Amino acid sequence: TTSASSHLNKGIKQVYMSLPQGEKVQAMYIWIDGTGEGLRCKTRTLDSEPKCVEELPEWNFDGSSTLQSEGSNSDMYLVPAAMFRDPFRKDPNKLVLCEVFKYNRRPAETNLRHTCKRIMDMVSNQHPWFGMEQEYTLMGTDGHPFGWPSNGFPGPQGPYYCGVGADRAYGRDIVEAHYRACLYAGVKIAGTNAEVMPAQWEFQIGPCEGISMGDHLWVARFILHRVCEDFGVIATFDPKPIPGNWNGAGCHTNFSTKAMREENGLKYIEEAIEKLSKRHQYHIRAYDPKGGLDNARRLTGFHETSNINDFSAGVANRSASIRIPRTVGQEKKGYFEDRRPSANCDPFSVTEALIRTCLLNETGDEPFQYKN
Amino acid sequence: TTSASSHLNKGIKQVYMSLPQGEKVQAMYIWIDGTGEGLRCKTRTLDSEPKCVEELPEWNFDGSSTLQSEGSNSDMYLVPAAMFRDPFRKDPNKLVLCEVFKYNRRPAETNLRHTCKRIMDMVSNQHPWFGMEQEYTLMGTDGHPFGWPSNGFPGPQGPYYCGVGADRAYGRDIVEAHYRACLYAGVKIAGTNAEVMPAQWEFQIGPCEGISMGDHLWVARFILHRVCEDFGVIATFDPKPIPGNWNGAGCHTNFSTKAMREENGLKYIEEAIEKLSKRHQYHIRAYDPKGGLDNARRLTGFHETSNINDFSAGVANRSASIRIPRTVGQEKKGYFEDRRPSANCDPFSVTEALIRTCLLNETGDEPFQYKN
Amino acid sequence: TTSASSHLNKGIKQVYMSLPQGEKVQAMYIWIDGTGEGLRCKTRTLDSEPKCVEELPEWNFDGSSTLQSEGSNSDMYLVPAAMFRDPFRKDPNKLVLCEVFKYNRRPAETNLRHTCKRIMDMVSNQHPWFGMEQEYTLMGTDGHPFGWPSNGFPGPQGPYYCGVGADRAYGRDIVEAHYRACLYAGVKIAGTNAEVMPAQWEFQIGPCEGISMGDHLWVARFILHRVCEDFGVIATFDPKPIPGNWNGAGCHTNFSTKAMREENGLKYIEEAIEKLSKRHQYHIRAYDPKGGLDNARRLTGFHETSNINDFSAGVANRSASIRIPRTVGQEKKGYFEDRRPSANCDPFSVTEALIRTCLLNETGDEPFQYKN
Amino acid sequence: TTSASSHLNKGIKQVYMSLPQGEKVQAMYIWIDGTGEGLRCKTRTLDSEPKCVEELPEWNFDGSSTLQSEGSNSDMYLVPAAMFRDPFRKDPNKLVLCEVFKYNRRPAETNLRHTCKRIMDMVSNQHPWFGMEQEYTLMGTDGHPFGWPSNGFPGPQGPYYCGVGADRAYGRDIVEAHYRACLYAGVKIAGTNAEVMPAQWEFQIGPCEGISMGDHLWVARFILHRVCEDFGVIATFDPKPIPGNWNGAGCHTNFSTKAMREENGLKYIEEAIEKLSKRHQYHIRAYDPKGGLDNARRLTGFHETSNINDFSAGVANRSASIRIPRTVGQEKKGYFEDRRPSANCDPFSVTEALIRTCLLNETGDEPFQYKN
Amino acid sequence: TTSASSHLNKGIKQVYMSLPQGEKVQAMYIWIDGTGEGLRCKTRTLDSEPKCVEELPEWNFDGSSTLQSEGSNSDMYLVPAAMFRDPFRKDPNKLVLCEVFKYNRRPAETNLRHTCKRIMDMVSNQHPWFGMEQEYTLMGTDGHPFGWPSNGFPGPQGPYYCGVGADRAYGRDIVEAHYRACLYAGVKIAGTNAEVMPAQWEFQIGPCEGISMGDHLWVARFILHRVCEDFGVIATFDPKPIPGNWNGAGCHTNFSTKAMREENGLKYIEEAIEKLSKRHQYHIRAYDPKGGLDNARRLTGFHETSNINDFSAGVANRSASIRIPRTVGQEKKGYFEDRRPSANCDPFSVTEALIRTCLLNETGDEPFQYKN
Numbered sequence A, B, C, D, E: 001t002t003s004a005s006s007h008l009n010k011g012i013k014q015v016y017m018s019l020p021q022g023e024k025v026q027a028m029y030i031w032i033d034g035t036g037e038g039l040r041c042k043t044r045t046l047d048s049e050p051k052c053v054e055e056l057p058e059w060n061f062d063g064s065s066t067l068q069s070e071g072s073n074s075d076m077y078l079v080p081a082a083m084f085r086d087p088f089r090k091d092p093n094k095l096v097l098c099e100v101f102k103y104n105r106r107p108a109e110t111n112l113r114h115t116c117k118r119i120m121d122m123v124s125n126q127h128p129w130f131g132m133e134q135e136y137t138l139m140g141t142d143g144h145p146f147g148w149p150s151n152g153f154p155g156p157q158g159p160y161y162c163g164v165g166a167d168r169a170y171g172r173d174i175v176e177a178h179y180r181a182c183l184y185a186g187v188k189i190a191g192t193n194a195e196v197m198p199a200q201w202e203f204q205i206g207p208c209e210g211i212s213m214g215d216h217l218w219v220a221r222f223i224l225h226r227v228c229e230d231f232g233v234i235a236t237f238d239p240k241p242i243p244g245n246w247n248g249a250g251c252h253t254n255f256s257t258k259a260m261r262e263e264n265g266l267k268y269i270e271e272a273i274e275k276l277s278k279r280h281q282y283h284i285r286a287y288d289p290k291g292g293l294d295n296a297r298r299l300t301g302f303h304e305t306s307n308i309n310d311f312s313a314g315v316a317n318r319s320a321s322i323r324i325p326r327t328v329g330q331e332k333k334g335y336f337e338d339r340r341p342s343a344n345c346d347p348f349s350v351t352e353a354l355i356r357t358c359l360l361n362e363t364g365d366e367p368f369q370y371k372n
């Protein structure tokens, strides 16, 4: 079933949304809350359209309502970081992604962009590109996957992957709407496909340079939640939404530098993979908002997945931790794919770890403080 | 859960509202009734579009149907005070807020704008600015909060504040429609956010100078009721809609003068707070249409509220009666927030009390009969 | 009777699809999976609008999710073959039909276009024209024909063929939508009619030259499946959807050469039919994805059908395996109709067999390996 | 008589400008050449629309063709400083005002904005406002005022000031076009009027804060020249275009600070005028691109002008060098007017002199090198 | 001063061009005639819009009317090479640049693209980029520069370079129209500026890869001639249109390879310049349609030009044959500028010579024949 809000008359809402706006402009501020997984938002009115992110004012919120601050000193501060066009209200209104700071101006516990940005600036001449494949499952308000038989299961897997038809693909209206909204907003969405599990979907973001990878994915996540709210369904990024013989959800991360993209760049790809082979446990902890417990329910070495305990790598191997595409090996240049991150990973944490291990030559179980 | 009127075919209505109007103009007169909380309205046809509020004629209504008039002499009179564009019928139609007068031209019992306007004119050179935060709860026609489980409760508080998603925010269609309608009408709406309680919302009005603060909030209240009527739900301003461990509803009032907004204006902010500390009982009575009984169900000292019995003030203190924002204290200028008024307060009463205590230096338990 | 996805608010989706796209372009890649009858699809973003099919890049997919490869070396490759406008997303977005190749660049088992194209190039100067009549039945998600009484049957056949009215034709909305979408996309749709069975329909594609007949029919099949997904119903190409005294579903194929279309071309029509009479078993095997088992449930010699194991031909005979239209016989030129292929046939298999038997004079029960 | 270019078919040009642009954007770079009075421009293509001035790249030009560079090291560099919308090409095309730097990155001789900007940054908290009244004369290509009798004169002065009618105002089409173009571009144009001499006009720019005054006036001058080019006439800023009993052209500059604009600000107005009284020769030198020679032909003490030799100030005195408006004197606050600058002054030089005499308390005949 | 055709009523023509086209499409074929500098054009009707250049048919013309063939065997053939949108007729009509072949299918004498294309295919992995600055002078039909005084001269040079105003820039309507038409057609126009001589202008094309530089410049030349035909003026590419102390017209060519554009690419820039120093006479011959006689009237060592019979090179030297920009020298990467080609050069001849000398290491006075 769907939510009570989705049963309201949507034609009424569009009549009000058709009213000409006038001179004022709406800006929606978006930030990550104390769980490191959820998003929050609210709107303020501006006198004129902002042209760049630098001319948006700072804002604030009460951190005791988001489990981010204690009692006495509960005020937290929002600092705009990236701006996009608003697909839900249209031009000239904006979406604003913000960094969160405590009352004493130190970064919040779940503010991982502050450290990630400094790391990205250390290797800016190498031009790192990232590409992330975000998988998710559409859910009903009753906790069951959308379009599944009530208290039951659909047919066995096999016909749902990249499927077409009323009996093969569930919820394509959400997917189509999310795709168009991202393109309007300016998010670098690269494609979509239906997944092995019915009502499971995937969209790809990238290639993005540096810190902009995390900014684009978080805004894409927000747009998906807001679109699903209109239809009355829930999108979940849980790695294993359904137990048993049903496909899980991950966030594959593709990585490349300027050196790897040039001729005979496969040599630098092999060197990065060698460095990654020595830090398996460090990346497992960084690829999860809970230190790796979430990914354990998904990475068991079955259904085209790698083992949580073991590191493996190979060309055109979809059962390994790291996969080199057959085309990349054939042309001796390109990129490589990290298949370990879970679907609920923080992109800032994932991208920072890749830079530290591969480009800054860090060792040990702790990140090196200041420089590399 | 929703009204029978909201199940009518809204597409039929839109066809009729698409008919070109012609030369005549509709004007809707709005006034406050004998309970001091309710609004009333009716429509007349004008020959041409009025350019200013002074061009609108006086009107009348039967006061025995609104519990505002005695038996024999029942006629009451409407005097236009402020004009806005009508978002429900579009240009050139208008909304008109009116003052209510008795058959002998004395102001009605619930007509509090008449005295508030004269007080505002006494301090016009100090340029008082007001900002009010209106909280409300969306309810179904069955007396239960909209989108709540039937005869039950949702999950515990914590994820609903500034939330996004089908399972976190209830009734955002109403909020979006109300925001755009106010902008079209000319109401100075400053922003909105979702509140701690699911289906609870807040919108900010201001900063407004003098008597215009009361006019803008009352018209914003009317627009919200009329928008909710289209969707078939009820908006309530009751301070404590749900007993127990559920968030209440208030109307925080922000106040500043020309002296407070200049450099080193924090000195004048502290002076006003000192004067307010001596008149706690006077402001409690003025901040409620019932005299304080309504606010007693909300101001108990828990859920980030101050006690109804005690006066407290501090910088960045959200549990005190008066709060100075940290940024204001750091820059030594700005405004201060009064967190005592209830969500169903009359803005004309609230703003008049602040001017009398802080700018006219009044004492005692009664207002000064003539001027100050 | 209809899917859960079809009960979502479609007005919401159209609001998002009204957003201006911008500079990027969506391309949907379509291919045939390992069962030989099902279609698959996924979408990628391009930087600018492609003008010809040669400008589209190659792509890939995981073949272990489509039963087209197992174990290691499961990656498959997609090569664009034909391009059409996208009726579901409108200009400048595109639909792309692709050929499938395995990891070593050999054609896949169900890739029959690769051999069919080379055969058509060997007879290019004779300009073969094909026309195919695709029959299908609309079904509810419960496995029963759409609009049929629950656990029951409608009235006896006879009033449904080419019928009009609420009690005679079921599902015309799908038929009208499919017709317009095909015209927009560029598919050579020639007409439609209602069939003997209620909820059964037919559309004609052609006349198409050479390899383009297979491309046009497959894309028309995809468009039909995607349109039915919007309405929440299933379109089936099963030869005998309902057992007993109810009409079956076939795919009649009309064939002509340049010599056949000229004056006194009936001589070459009779020559081709004579050659077809000697290869009945070879064409039965090639007219079915199961080698003839599916067509056995349909071709029993009743309800205006030919016998599965007997070959017959005649002028104006609708019970024979090959029919010469009376107009063609009178004018001594034109085409002829093969009524044996089943509704779920692969068009590349059907067209290739006709060329081999009639134009290349092949004999035996195997196709000639090299040219001719 | 008018230019040959203006006799070309303008309808032909408008057909070409109706063609849709596409994705590329034109940017016109504008700078001041070696004479200190003339403007230069050229256009480049950009890949996408820039949102702020900081996104525009640096450019260069050959300084030996503009007489501000030597032979061997003639390359000069352009640094964008302010961006406006282009009224001649419309959105999304831009106008860019730039600063000029030598090959060794030192400012050019006529680059007066570099020093003026630093002076404005050390009085930023006082918020200086400027308003300038630019007078000009429209001239034919034959060197005679536009619309004047051939080899002769019109009637005596008196009916032309703020005149209407074919025999009173010459060239209102240029004035109307210039007013609209400035509003579209974002130039803060405040008004226009016809002047005492026929074919003489005036437009007012402001009030502008700090360094913005120079940028807005220079761009307004460029727009005027470009508009006159379309009509085939010449706009001249020469202080005395016609000898004898005909009105001259000035550039009255209005000045105020935050203290001047507050209650009892007349005290600070009188303070600044006292400081200006002892630096008359310094300001005459700075109010002219030739050190004062040009203004000598205009400021002779006749036709409502002050003498070039002596300093005078008074309330409501239009014959004095400094004039206090009567309303300002009555309300005891506001601004004051400097009537000395000639119509061909550089605004960066004029505004810099006012601030460092009235706000930084400089003395002597040379500017202070550091800070002040 | 202008053509008789330009005095016809252009409003009449625009009425006919407003008629809806229908289904047919116009295609204008363009080629270079026997003088090596002039262009010819011809229009045919097509049944449907062509999507790529490969689907346009071959055409022919009578070569004895263009002095390209002898008497008996005079038929020539046109082969499409590049396609652009038509700015004079708008979509869906096209411009088609063609190669010319003799009756025996051998390339014509002035067909230099055929050899240039094969040379560019030998170095395609080095990605050569070209950028050309085309200078031209606008002339009246009487043989005098447009807007110049009859039988006379304007003022001395110096105020016309990058000038604005009726007395400074002549013919900007043509320049603006040409700019917009090129953007619509798809020509990579990079910018424009006014030149030292009044009525002299320049537009830049590039950066273009490989053979596309010749196609883009030739089509830009055609568009300029056709635009000037509308206004009734002549555009000339003669190197020295006016004898004496008036600037000439050149076609400076900028060149870069992939190695030159990478870090420390200045090393490969110096190597190419070193090779160019040995082949001055060979490049002088190839930079002129008449072998060098035209460029002799321009390259005399005065007015910022190099000597015709002397080679020089330097950083930031505008008087040398080859100039290295100062920014390129400082960043140690980029491109370099060849200032020797005259304004009437053939771009295919110019680009081919640069590749042969710098990338293929050719020596001697003749090009290498055996495909190298």
Ligand SMILES: Nc1ncnc2c1ncn2[C@@H]1O[C@H](COP(=O)(O)OP(=O)(O)OP(=O)(O)O)[C@@H](O)[C@H]1O
Pocket (backbone or CB within 6 Å): A129, A130, A131, A132, A133, A190, A204, A205, A206, A207, A252, A254, A255, A256, A261, A334, A335, A337, C062
């Ligand atoms: N050079 C590159 N550097 C970084 N990321 C890249 C690069 N090139 C492509 N990518 C990214 O790689 C991703 C490609 O993954 P995609 O989902 O298309 O295929 P796949 O990984 O083979 O599929 P599957 O879902 O079966 O694993 C995209 O997000 C794309 O943006």
Ligand SMILES: Nc1ncnc2c1ncn2[C@@H]1O[C@H](COP(=O)(O)OP(=O)(O)OP(=O)(O)O)[C@@H](O)[C@H]1O
Pocket (backbone or CB within 6 Å): A062, B129, B130, B131, B132, B133, B190, B204, B205, B206, B207, B252, B254, B255, B256, B261, B334, B335, B337
């Ligand atoms: N100078 C001012 N004078 C008066 N009101 C002001 C002034 N500046 C801002 N305001 C008003 O103060 C209000 C700000 O309240 P807002 O809801 O944004 O934040 P808050 O009080 O921190 O939040 P919360 O709901 O958590 O208490 C607005 O209504 C705004 O118009």
Ligand SMILES: Nc1ncnc2c1ncn2[C@@H]1O[C@H](COP(=O)(O)OP(=O)(O)OP(=O)(O)O)[C@@H](O)[C@H]1O
Pocket (backbone or CB within 6 Å): C129, C130, C131, C132, C133, C190, C204, C205, C206, C207, C252, C254, C255, C256, C261, C334, C335
């Ligand atoms: N010369 C030709 N060569 C090939 N196909 C042709 C030729 N002329 C027509 N056709 C095709 O023949 C088909 C005719 O199908 P149609 O549905 O009209 O047949 P019908 O005679 O009404 O038969 P039925 O009752 O079995 O449906 C069309 O698909 C048309 O494109």
Ligand SMILES: Nc1ncnc2c1ncn2[C@@H]1O[C@H](COP(=O)(O)OP(=O)(O)OP(=O)(O)O)[C@@H](O)[C@H]1O
Pocket (backbone or CB within 6 Å): D129, D130, D131, D132, D133, D190, D204, D205, D206, D207, D252, D254, D255, D256, D261, D334, D335
């Ligand atoms: N507070 C202020 N500070 C600075 N400039 C100001 C201020 N207020 C107004 N101005 C400017 O003063 C100028 C007034 O010019 P205006 O031509 O209207 O004056 P005027 O009295 O008619 O003069 P005149 O008769 O000599 O033309 C405008 O450019 C306006 O922007």
Ligand SMILES: Nc1ncnc2c1ncn2[C@@H]1O[C@H](COP(=O)(O)OP(=O)(O)OP(=O)(O)O)[C@@H](O)[C@H]1O
Pocket (backbone or CB within 6 Å): D060, D061, D062, E129, E130, E131, E132, E133, E190, E204, E205, E206, E207, E252, E254, E255, E256, E261, E334, E335
């Ligand atoms: N890397 C490159 N390779 C080749 N051409 C390039 C490259 N970068 C820029 N160009 C081209 O160089 C040209 C620069 O011409 P431009 O008119 O700006 O030169 P300039 O320095 O102003 O010289 P001039 O004073 O002689 O006109 C453009 O046509 C541009 O496309």
Ligand SMILES: [Mg+2]
Pocket (backbone or CB within 6 Å): A133, A202
């Ligand atoms: Mg993927």
Ligand SMILES: [Mg+2]
Pocket (backbone or CB within 6 Å): A133, A252, A337
């Ligand atoms: Mg992947």
Ligand SMILES: [Mg+2]
Pocket (backbone or CB within 6 Å): B133, B202, B204
């Ligand atoms: Mg608030």
Ligand SMILES: [Mg+2]
Pocket (backbone or CB within 6 Å): B133, B252, B337
């Ligand atoms: Mg508050």
Ligand SMILES: [Mg+2]
Pocket (backbone or CB within 6 Å): C133, C202, C204
């Ligand atoms: Mg048929």
Ligand SMILES: [Mg+2]
Pocket (backbone or CB within 6 Å): C133, C252, C337
């Ligand atoms: Mg048939």
Ligand SMILES: [Mg+2]
Pocket (backbone or CB within 6 Å): D133, D202, D204
């Ligand atoms: Mg004036």
Ligand SMILES: [Mg+2]
Pocket (backbone or CB within 6 Å): D133, D252, D337
């Ligand atoms: Mg003045």
Ligand SMILES: [Mg+2]
Pocket (backbone or CB within 6 Å): E133, E202, E204
């Ligand atoms: Mg140039």
Ligand SMILES: [Mg+2]
Pocket (backbone or CB within 6 Å): E133, E202
């Ligand atoms: Mg030049």
